[PDB]
Amino acid sequence: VNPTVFFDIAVDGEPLGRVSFELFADKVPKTAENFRALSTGEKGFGYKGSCFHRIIPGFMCQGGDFTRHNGTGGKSIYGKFEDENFILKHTGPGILSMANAGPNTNGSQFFICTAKTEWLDGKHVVFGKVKEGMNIVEAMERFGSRNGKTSKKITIADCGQLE
Amino acid sequence: XLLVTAXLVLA
Ligand SMILES: [Cl-]
Ligand SMILES: [Cl-]
């Protein structure tokens, strides 16, 4: 069964709302498990309290750097890891996909698309989709800018698994 | 451009 995970988002500490994601463990099990475990914190580390350091309106929200807090850091539950496959494409808003530094450099950083990002197909591993709370993602998006810097700090105040 | 990288953010 494909797991469901949630982020509770805050804006400069003010609770905003919840975003939930279906993780496509049937197609990309290793990539899904990494995100799931980092979301629960069950390995002893993960996304809770980290920020979306880069948000570009009309494009995506990028987060998952819980080691350096600025996009330069990140670590998977495996100690980087391989691009599992490119079966799923960046088809529209709500797509959940891995940030990277080129081939086989998956860590913990990810992005939530707010539009179709077809130009990233074959280069970033898609592993989930927003299930509920796309309205919250759209609210987050408004705090971004062209260069990615956010006008208020957008944080994962809490995160975990629903199903 | 519009990229999602970890390390050098590019065009
Ligand atoms: Cl709303
Ligand atoms: Cl709002």
Active site residue A69: no
Sheet strand arrangement including A60-63: A54-56, A60-63, A110-113, A95-98, A126-132, A14-23, A4-11, A154-161
Active site residue A135: no
Residue pointed to by tokens 């003010």: A14
Residue pointed to by tokens 């592993």: A127
Q: Name all domains of chain A by residue range, CATH numbers in brackets.
A: 1-163 (2.40.100.10)
Alpha helix ranges (H) inside A101-148:
134-141
Contacts of B9 in chain A (CB under 8 A): 54, 71, 148
Rounded to an integer, what distance in angstroms lies between the CA atom of residue A105 and that of residue A89? 18
**CA A44–ligand 1 middle distance (angstroms):** 32
Q: What is the DSSP letter of A120?
A: G
> Of the candidates A12, A5, A4, A6, which has an alpha carbon nearest to the alpha carbon of residue A140?
A12
User: What is the SS3 assignment for A131?
Assistant: strand
Indicate the residue type of A127. F
Distances (CA, A) of A113 to A47, A69, A77, A148, A162: 18, 20, 23, 14, 22
